Write an enzyme that holds these catalytic residues in place. Sequence first.
Site, PDB file in Angstrom:
ATOM      1  N   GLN A  72      -8.245 -26.634 -22.428  1.00  0.00           N
ATOM      2  CA  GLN A  72      -8.567 -28.014 -22.007  1.00  0.00           C
ATOM      3  C   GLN A  72      -7.409 -28.829 -21.482  1.00  0.00           C
ATOM      4  O   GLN A  72      -7.344 -29.457 -20.348  1.00  0.00           O
ATOM      5  CB  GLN A  72      -9.296 -28.720 -22.908  1.00  0.00           C
ATOM      6  CG  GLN A  72      -9.731 -30.182 -22.466  1.00  0.00           C
ATOM      7  CD  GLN A  72     -10.476 -30.951 -23.434  1.00  0.00           C
ATOM      8  OE1 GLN A  72     -11.341 -30.368 -24.247  1.00  0.00           O
ATOM      9  NE2 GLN A  72     -11.149 -32.086 -23.312  1.00  0.00           N
ATOM     10  N   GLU A  97     -14.649 -21.593 -22.048  1.00  0.00           N
ATOM     11  CA  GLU A  97     -15.763 -22.212 -22.092  1.00  0.00           C
ATOM     12  C   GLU A  97     -15.745 -22.836 -20.628  1.00  0.00           C
ATOM     13  O   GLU A  97     -14.639 -23.196 -20.219  1.00  0.00           O
ATOM     14  CB  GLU A  97     -16.137 -23.061 -23.149  1.00  0.00           C
ATOM     15  CG  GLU A  97     -14.905 -24.297 -23.067  1.00  0.00           C
ATOM     16  CD  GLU A  97     -15.350 -25.461 -22.214  1.00  0.00           C
ATOM     17  OE1 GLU A  97     -16.562 -25.335 -22.046  1.00  0.00           O
ATOM     18  OE2 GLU A  97     -14.289 -26.403 -21.961  1.00  0.00           O
ATOM     19  N   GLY A 142      -6.688 -23.474 -29.823  1.00  0.00           N
ATOM     20  CA  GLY A 142      -6.833 -22.064 -30.305  1.00  0.00           C
ATOM     21  C   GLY A 142      -7.002 -21.601 -28.953  1.00  0.00           C
ATOM     22  O   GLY A 142      -6.596 -20.183 -28.702  1.00  0.00           O
ATOM     23  N   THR A 172      -4.695 -33.646 -34.408  1.00  0.00           N
ATOM     24  CA  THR A 172      -5.836 -33.611 -33.772  1.00  0.00           C
ATOM     25  C   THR A 172      -6.745 -32.335 -34.405  1.00  0.00           C
ATOM     26  O   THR A 172      -8.094 -32.633 -34.793  1.00  0.00           O
ATOM     27  CB  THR A 172      -5.802 -33.345 -32.375  1.00  0.00           C
ATOM     28  OG1 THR A 172      -5.336 -32.211 -32.008  1.00  0.00           O
ATOM     29  CG2 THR A 172      -5.080 -34.468 -31.584  1.00  0.00           C
ATOM     30  N   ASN A 190       2.264 -35.615 -27.535  1.00  0.00           N
ATOM     31  CA  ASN A 190       1.165 -36.464 -27.034  1.00  0.00           C
ATOM     32  C   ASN A 190       2.111 -38.229 -27.518  1.00  0.00           C
ATOM     33  O   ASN A 190       1.665 -39.057 -27.032  1.00  0.00           O
ATOM     34  CB  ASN A 190       0.006 -36.326 -27.606  1.00  0.00           C
ATOM     35  CG  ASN A 190      -0.380 -35.016 -26.801  1.00  0.00           C
ATOM     36  OD1 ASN A 190      -0.146 -34.751 -25.852  1.00  0.00           O
ATOM     37  ND2 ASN A 190      -1.402 -34.357 -27.849  1.00  0.00           N
ATOM     38  N   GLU A 225      18.860 -21.394 -10.561  1.00  0.00           N
ATOM     39  CA  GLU A 225      19.997 -22.119 -10.928  1.00  0.00           C
ATOM     40  C   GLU A 225      19.707 -22.970 -12.470  1.00  0.00           C
ATOM     41  O   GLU A 225      20.611 -23.048 -13.013  1.00  0.00           O
ATOM     42  CB  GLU A 225      20.244 -23.305  -9.900  1.00  0.00           C
ATOM     43  CG  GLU A 225      21.185 -22.678  -8.580  1.00  0.00           C
ATOM     44  CD  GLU A 225      21.635 -23.701  -7.457  1.00  0.00           C
ATOM     45  OE1 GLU A 225      22.444 -24.448  -7.968  1.00  0.00           O
ATOM     46  OE2 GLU A 225      20.786 -23.777  -6.681  1.00  0.00           O
TER      47      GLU A 225
END
Lengths: 427, 427, 428, 439, 50, 189
Positions: free
Chosen positions: D11, D71, D144, D179, D206, D254
């Site tokens: 996701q 999914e 996962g 999370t 995050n 480079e």
Amino acid sequence: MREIVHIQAGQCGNQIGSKFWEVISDEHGIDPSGQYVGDSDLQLERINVYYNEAGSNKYVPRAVLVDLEPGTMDSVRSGPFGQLFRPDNYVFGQSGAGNNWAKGHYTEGAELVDNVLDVVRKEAESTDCLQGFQLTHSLGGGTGSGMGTLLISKIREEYPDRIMNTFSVVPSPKVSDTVVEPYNATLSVHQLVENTDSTFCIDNEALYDICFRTLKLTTPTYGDLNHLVSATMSGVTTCLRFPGQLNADLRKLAVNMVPFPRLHFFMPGFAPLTSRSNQQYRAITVPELTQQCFDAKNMMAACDPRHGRYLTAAAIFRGRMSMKEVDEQMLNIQNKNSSYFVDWIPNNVKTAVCDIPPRGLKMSATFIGNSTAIQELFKRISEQFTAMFRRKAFLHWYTGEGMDEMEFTEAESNMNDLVSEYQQYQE
Amino acid sequence: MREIVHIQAGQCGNQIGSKFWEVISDEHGIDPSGQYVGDSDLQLERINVYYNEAGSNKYVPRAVLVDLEPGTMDSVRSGPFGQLFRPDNYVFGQSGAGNNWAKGHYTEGAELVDNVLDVVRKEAESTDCLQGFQLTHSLGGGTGSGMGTLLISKIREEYPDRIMNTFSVVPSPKVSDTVVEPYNATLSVHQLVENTDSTFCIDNEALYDICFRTLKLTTPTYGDLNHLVSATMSGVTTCLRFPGQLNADLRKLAVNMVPFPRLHFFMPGFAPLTSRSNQQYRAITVPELTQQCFDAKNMMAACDPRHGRYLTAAAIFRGRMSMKEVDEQMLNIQNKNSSYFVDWIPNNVKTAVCDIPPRGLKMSATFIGNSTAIQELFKRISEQFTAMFRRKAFLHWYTGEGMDEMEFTEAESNMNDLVSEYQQYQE
Amino acid sequence: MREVISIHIGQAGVQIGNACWELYCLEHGIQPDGQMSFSTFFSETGSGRHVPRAVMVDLEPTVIDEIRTGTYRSLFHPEQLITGKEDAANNYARGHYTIGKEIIDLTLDRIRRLADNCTGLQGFLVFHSFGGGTGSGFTSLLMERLSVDYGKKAKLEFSIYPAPQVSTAVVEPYNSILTTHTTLEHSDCSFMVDNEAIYDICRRNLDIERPSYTNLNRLIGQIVSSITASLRFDGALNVDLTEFQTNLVPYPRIHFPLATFSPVISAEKAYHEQLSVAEITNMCFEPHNQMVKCDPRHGKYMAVCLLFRGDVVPKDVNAAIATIKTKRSIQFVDWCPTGFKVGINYQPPTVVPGGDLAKVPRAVCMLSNTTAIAEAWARLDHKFDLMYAKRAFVHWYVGEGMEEGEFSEAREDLAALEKDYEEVGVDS
Amino acid sequence: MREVISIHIGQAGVQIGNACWELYCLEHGIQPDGQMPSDRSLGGSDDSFSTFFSETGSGRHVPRAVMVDLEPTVIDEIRTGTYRSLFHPEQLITGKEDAANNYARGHYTIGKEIIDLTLDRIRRLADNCTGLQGFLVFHSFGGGTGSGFTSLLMERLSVDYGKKAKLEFSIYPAPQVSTAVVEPYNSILTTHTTLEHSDCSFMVDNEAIYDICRRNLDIERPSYTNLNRLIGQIVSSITASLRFDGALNVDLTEFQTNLVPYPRIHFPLATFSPVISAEKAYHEQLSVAEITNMCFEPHNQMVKCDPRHGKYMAVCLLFRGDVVPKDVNAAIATIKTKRSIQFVDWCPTGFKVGINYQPPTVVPGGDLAKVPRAVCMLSNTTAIAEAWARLDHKFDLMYAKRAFVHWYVGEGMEEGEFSEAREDLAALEKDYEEVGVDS
Amino acid sequence: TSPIGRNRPRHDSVADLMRQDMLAGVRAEVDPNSPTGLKNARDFGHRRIW
Amino acid sequence: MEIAFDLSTIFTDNIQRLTRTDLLKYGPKRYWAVAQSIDCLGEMSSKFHGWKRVITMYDKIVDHDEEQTTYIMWEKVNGSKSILKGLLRVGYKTLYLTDNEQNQYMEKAMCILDFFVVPTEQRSGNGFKMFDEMLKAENVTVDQCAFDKPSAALQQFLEKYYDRKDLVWQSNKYALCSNFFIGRHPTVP
Ligand SMILES: Nc1nc2c(ncn2[C@@H]2O[C@H](COP(=O)(O)CP(=O)(O)OP(=O)(O)O)[C@@H](O)[C@H]2O)c(=O)[nH]1
Ligand SMILES: Nc1nc2c(ncn2[C@@H]2O[C@H](COP(=O)(O)OP(=O)(O)OP(=O)(O)O)[C@@H](O)[C@H]2O)c(=O)[nH]1
């Protein structure tokens, strides 16, 4: 004084002839309507060789249009230079021969050849002194090959002395598009050997290779190939229409090229072919012109010139240039590449210079080479013909028109004879 | 008669070469489109030194533009003067060297150098008498530092007698822009020592310092740096293209500037460098021009000339002037700074005067210096290389490409030997 | 100039003709009621009405009544819509012997009247199905009479062939075997198509979950338009019907080539595809892209004709041909080294509104004569032998006028044809 | 002609791909449906859009991207969103059901069901390519689906292509913002595969972008869209060199040569220095000096790690916009003057400058203010080792109790793999510790 | 509608190519604001100083 | 440059409007002159621009998905030979617009695909008649048309006539005037 009769047979022949007439009109400054709009008086000095006077400053080509498919004739008439010809000269049938040599030579060709010969004779009788006949056709097709063979036989019977040159397109396996085209080529080379003073072999594969490599064209079309052939044809006959330091017309060339009567298959070329970018940065010189003329890539025969020996070679130049500059270049070419020229001929090279270049060009060189390397095309054609004839690949279609199977065997032997004599002098 | 072939490698070398041909065309009166627009025949009397002629009043540079990445190629082609160059001279591979000496010197340069040598040899054989090759490249990069040196070695193999000039840019820590540049510099120093007749080291820090103080440019970019380098370019070779009282070609400069074969690393400069606002603030004449040719802050190289005495110096003047005035100025400079010159040389400075100054300047002087102070930059590069190699900071890339520690040690030893040779005469 | 007559027999042929004439009207801009280059397929009346050169005949009037009450009721001249009283009931014997003679005279008279209307008759087009009774008995009788009357004139037909599994009639093998004897006797070139292969094509390429007869007929009409385009549209390397027959018929009996239309892909996918000449030419030879349920790799290609349409350049065609030849998986007979018949037309294909086909810029229809087609004959012969070992339904046929020995003669003719196919494919 | 292939997994990868492809379409003037209305630009700077977008026969442009996920819902959003017609339908690879945040499911059981299709699509895309420069991978370590599919696919890509560069921008797990309760296991497992089969991996945190948006952008509660936009800006700034002309260009080769001293030290940081709201930016000039200073500010780092606790080995500055080398030289000199920014003694010139005249592009309604110049700092530093140490500590604490071993071992996983990955990451931390000490 | 006739197959591009006379030799100036124009004016270009 | 056909026999006036329908009615089957003229004009345009591809030819215009119109001006020289002077193209396309302060917009605008005039006819007030005739033909103003990557001469002309300078740039390489009367912004700036 030395006018030439021009005949176009088959779709490829008609397209090449249309492009050639467009090129000639460009050179002579002739309006597509037929009016003269040139800016030089030298053009009209010898315009009669290719065109017939129409009185009111209008000129029409001395061309005979023949094709069994009316679609090609309609396309040419609707084309950019359709109105240049006169409607009387157009000849056409009902349906095409269907890639069938027998159909286009024994029944349909036999029925149309009466009108074809009638119009050809009517055009010929109107000349002052007919220098010879030129014909554009393709060996791969059926209509073009059969009609060309029949018409060249008929003209040789009717004109036993005039020069006959044919600008034929020789099929090659790489760009092959017709299943039965080797049969047509085998049936046509017989008559070409029998009754043609000179046959210029053209391969579409070689033209595409030149356009891709030297010209660097993004996507070549049939128009470009026809333009190349037209430029070469115009360069060949430039001595008849324009003055020059050394004149070399059709008869002098024919004498100077062929060592023997039946070895009359030439391989042409054109010098100033240059890519878009290199046009402004290439110092076009006589050494450069002759180097690219003798370049293998620039040659329009898919056969490698190095795979053989040059019997006789002629380079026709256009534009102002010193004679010594050309002679020294020819000697240099004959010395450096002596292995590519036959020893038994004391002077393998022929030269020609014309004072008037092609329009928009500083100077140009047209090369024609009678080398034994042409035997490779005939070898491939004979191999394909034997492979198909071993199992009777398509003989029923041709026998349906009454043509005997024995003709195929005789033609193959004559194919061997042409190769053998070329191989006889090949060393 | 004495033609010169130019080779451009890497983006930096290509930029400097483009500026070179822009300035030369300005001096020779050649329009960017490639047509001669000059007024004085002296600009054209020996134009063959740099530009090959196309015959129709059109000239193309005798330059070999090459780089691994085609991006630089089409960037040059899109430039204001890119159209002038010959398309066949544009040689390129697939992608850039990635600042990797091994990539540009052993595999990718290995494939491309065959075509590069082919085009260079073909272009060279078109000259009546090729005096030598002068090349522009960057030490800090990979493409230049590797492939230019490989080409230099190949040309030296193919031309052991013709002069070689390597107008190259050396890296410095102060304006360092690449992490891996010292590796390229140390790998290229040995090749330059062993395969070059004349080397003109250039540093960007010196260029920025000159622009900031000497010339007072508000925000100079690479364009102005390359313009100064190209001014030096034209100044060093102005003798071959115009008449002069003291005519000295590159061979004479090499003879005067090279006491010993391994001491051929030079250090250039430009005399009339003055700001726009100070043009009326200062009047130009031979004394201050000669003084500025030896000024530390006007020198093209980062190293301070004060710390190392000059071995030999060359002052190439242009424009009308008095020979005796030049001699007096040179003798005064030599006497007033005898501690800055080696005693064992009876006369360090040898001059040369041309009769044509650069456009926009009344008269100009170009300084060449074989000072022992050059060893400072080599010492800095060598110590950086030792610090990096003490832990093998980036050796894995080169080893994967095929490089070995032995080559690195050999290059470092050779460069330290060159530094020791400079120190030998440093007394 | 160059006209061709189309004759429709049986429900399958009538529906296929409906689709192809809809496509022709879309291509030439002819309105569905006949209002408004086109001379090949239509005759222009003085009043401006355009009449297709088609014959609609079926022993059951329902399928013809569908057109007579459908959109194109005013398109066709009324006498072209020949109808009987009752269908052949899927019986070849009923279709030909007892019944077909009742209207065969009127049908041949109508064909003669249409032929005399035109002058440049290039050939004939017949649409029918082997499985059906009418489209096999009436087709046999009409086409043999037509061949006897004309002879040297070209005779082309498009016949639907029973699937290995999808069989809507039990008596399909019998009628197919009976017709195969005469389709080898008079037809100059037969275009055999299988419904199951078109279903697979629609499921795989077009991603249609629920295909229908409309899509199959649309694809067939597209192929017929592609083959007939060279007679009515400009383009380099025109391929006439006579040229086509000369190219793809090496033996008098080996005239059963395959057919396929390559650029069949969903509209939502077509916009994101280059659709280059080389790519479409390569995917022409996909084993699952042939509308005859037989793997080309099983057999060997013997004569292949390509009809490129739209934006096509000959150099790209040559490159594609060279790449195909280099592919050893696409085998060719050793005695035909140059079996490729290239054809190019400048007219791009049109898309039927509501049709599954997308507006591709260039298209090509590949027609190859290969030995792999013998699998269909093998399947049909196996089915006929199994069904005839016990004489399953011979009584209807023998009671409808035909003799018992005719079945054996048809079977031995099929065996001879299969033997010829096996023999022609051997190396020399 | 040069071109690159972008691969997005999971996701997070899919959303980052959506954002960066929106940014690319805006930069090259490409409509959301794939159309390019700028007909004149089609004959000019062709290589610019050809770097990222393939050319169709209809004049449309197809991004060289692969949308793959176990999914369909995250991909169903694309098939239903604005860019449904932008991407080629076959590249929108969707599995049946997600991996449920399990690395084993995405590596052994469910990954193999579509890995062949993904490789086939990649091969088809690469065949159309001529001057392929490298691969861009987008995934999340802690998840996962991402960690499993990337692990399964990286080795296949490496064995298929080899020398071709493989670059991945991945979201490294936060030290405090957790999370998934089982994300450290997946992170440790994917650390092994990302080390062996990559060329350079860019860490992303995050919480770092959270605090950056809180401070510089003044937005108190940012969503994932802002993070996606910032990461898209990072990748666009990195790739601007290939598709645009500039002085002192830095291509993939480079960049890799400069920022990878050793094969196992290919984990650099990433940060976009000129992050500022529209209202705030109006009051500052944002010249080269101040943005270069902000480059090395710890608060501007997009990974939660303290640079002052470590040292800088190699730093790359891909300047874009109106930039001249004098400003870069002055800024680098001023940076080298201060001793707070400590470099390794064995790399005196660890700076790689890259300048492009293409200005940064801001999306409509974007958080980033329009700015004439922008710099995207890429640095290889030892300060990243602290985050890895914390992650290893958390992994050891979780694995000591064998808290979630059963879930992994029930999907074709061996318990020894956890120990192997742990010792690999410990050895890598020891390698950073060894390379970080001065001679 | 009507059939679409393409002039591209009927196009003759070698006619200009074979003709040594060229309408070329003129180039369109690159936009200064464009990145190509910026590069040409700054990195390639140099403001007069002598 | 020069065409060997009398364009008066087919063109009603000096400057002609050529919609896709008009191109269909002027097909190259028997009217090769107009197709050759438009192709040569496009080739000259590309050569002047120094591009690797041409963007103005009959085939792509007639095959273009959206309807387009073309304007050509010429001059009578000879009885069956004329001269090519200029070209002009514009059509309907949909664009996403963004003005100052980052305000999203969307509307149908007159997007001018190309401008070019023959180099031998450069300057001397050529093409302003084309501008006026077009804006009278489809009755739209300058503010209502979109410009596709103008070259310096183009906004120079826009400030010379109608005084529409300071062209606002767009993310889709298009440029328009600073005056946006369309409004109806989908997104608040
Ligand atoms: N005086 C100038 N130095 C330049 C210029 N462009 C680059 N350079 C210098 O070039 C040095 C690096 O060399 P290059 O840029 O040629 C890199 P390389 O040789 O690998 O070539 P490429 O792979 O083609 O990029 C670096 O020290 C720059 O300061 C320029 O226009 N002028
Ligand atoms: N491809 C295709 N096949 C069709 C279509 N309609 C019918 N068929 C086939 O035609 C066969 C059915 O037999 P028909 O030929 O219709 O029967 P018939 O006895 O000849 O004639 P009718 O009794 O009038 O139907 C089967 O093979 C069907 O699949 C159609 O629209 N498309």
